[PDB]
């Protein structure tokens, strides 16, 4: 969850989503056996 400028040794790396297709909500369930 770090926000630092990205030097590819080309700037802020967090792209924003466009309200492309309709957004989806995803839940992943993991089980310990």
């Amino acid at each position: 969850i770090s926000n630092v400028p990205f030097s590819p040794d080309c700037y802020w790396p967090l792209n924003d989503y466009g309200f492309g297709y309709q957004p989806y909500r995803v839940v992943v369930l993991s089980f310990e056996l």
């Binding site: 969850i1 770090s2 926000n3 630092v4």
Partner: peptide, 30 residues
Amino acid sequence: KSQSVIIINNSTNVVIRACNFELCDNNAFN
């Protein structure tokens, strides 16, 4: 700027906490 976890016990109690921390040598958010 990076997540970090501390696992410290104070004299009776064990506390584990994973946040963004300032770290000292020789506050806390998210």
